[PDB]
Design a binder for this molecule. Sequence first.
Ligand code: NA
Length: 232
Amino acid sequence: MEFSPPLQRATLIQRYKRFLADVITPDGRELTLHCPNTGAMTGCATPGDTVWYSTSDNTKRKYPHTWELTQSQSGAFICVNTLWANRLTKEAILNESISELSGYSSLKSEVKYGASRIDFMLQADSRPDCYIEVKSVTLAENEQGYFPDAVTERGQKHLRELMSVAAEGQRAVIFFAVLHSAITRFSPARHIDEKYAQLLSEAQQRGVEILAYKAEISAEGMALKKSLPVTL
Ligand code: NA
């Protein structure tokens, strides 16, 4: 997808209170951005990093600018606004960048199915229903990507739900959208949430497919393109 209109740049002073960031624009003035990420944002919010923000045109809200990307001091692009993940995924399924998910005749979003909600469900006359859970990956240590970047009991629960989907003979996919341009491989963060990492291995055992695709990212746009090796 393309950022429309294109993003503007600034220099980070600090992210604070989770949802706010003070930045300095190219004119040397201060500006407060909405930070649409509630997580730790490890490696994504270093004072002095360049940030890229969008502008909401027709709103009277207090902070009509949103922090979209970080361009780290080592030159890497990071999409900190992980609220784009589902859209990038849908776009990549439909344009067939994600080959493992081609050959379905319909795509539905936000499907409530059980006594739980799935990000996408793919369907076809000849095939079992395909359930896709989308996860965002912004944690990098050099080239190694990790999820989660803090313990997640909610993540653990959804992972268990996917196992039930597979057990019932549906196709079940967990899809890690990799939003940091430095990442070249993916693993669960066993060192951070050991239980999640264990559940991820167990889900694989029980037939949940695990994919990780990397986004190409610039101030102009982002697109999921490249598949990445996963090591449990
Ligand atoms: Na999700």
